[PDB]
């Protein structure tokens, strides 16, 4: 269990990577944040639009 979680942290870092660039004004930290709850690009990015993070 532990090598798929931490392979998937990898994961989730280049995913707030990837967001950050669409998203400079937003805050890493808080973009790494949303992804371990949503686990997906286009949620975080759905919630970044509504004005939740």
């Not at 280049?14 to 967001?19: D, F, P, V, Y």
């Given at each position: 269990?532990?090598?798929?979680?931490?392979?998937?942290?990898?994961?989730?870092?280049?995913?707030?990577?990837?967001?950050?660039?669409?998203?400079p004004q937003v805050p890493y930290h808080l973009v790494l944040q949303d992804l371990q709850l949503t686990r997906s690009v286009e949620i975080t990015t759905d919630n970044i639009l509504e004005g939740r993070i």
């Open positions: 269990r532990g090598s798929e979680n931490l392979y998937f942290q990898g994961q989730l870092n280049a995913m707030a990577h990837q967001i950050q660039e669409m998203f």
